[PDB]
């Protein structure tokens, strides 16, 4: 999310960091919450070769 100005001396596009890193880590929060592991181990109940 950035800025853009306009005046008698030209133009200029900047950015804004505080809001940018306010947004990235929450998705990173959602990512690291979703990227997780099962601890539950399942055996062999049904045969296959007969």
């Amino acid at each position: 999310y950035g800025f853009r100005h306009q005046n008698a001396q030209g133009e200029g596009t900047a950015a804004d960091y505080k809001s940018t890193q306010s947004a990235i880590d929450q998705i990173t929060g959602k990512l690291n919450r979703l990227i997780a592991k099962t601890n539950q181990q399942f055996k062999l109940i049904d045969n296959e070769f007969n």
Binding site: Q26, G29, K30, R33
Partner: protein, 50 residues
């Protein structure tokens, strides 16, 4: 000459997991799992045969 506005806080909060954190400090909280049984077959109103 000014009328500010605020909320309420305590000294010691409790730490709860939201959907985008671990451990946020929150003014009150509530247990949702049960841990303590009663070591007795509470059999009021049922004609029990041991």
């Amino acid at each position: 000459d000014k009328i500010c506005l605020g909320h309420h806080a305590v000294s010691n909060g409790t730490k709860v997991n939201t959907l985008t954190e671990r451990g946020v400090e929150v003014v009150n909280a509530t247990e949702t799992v049960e841990r303590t049984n009663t070591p007795r077959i509470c059999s009021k109103g049922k004609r029990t045969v041991d």
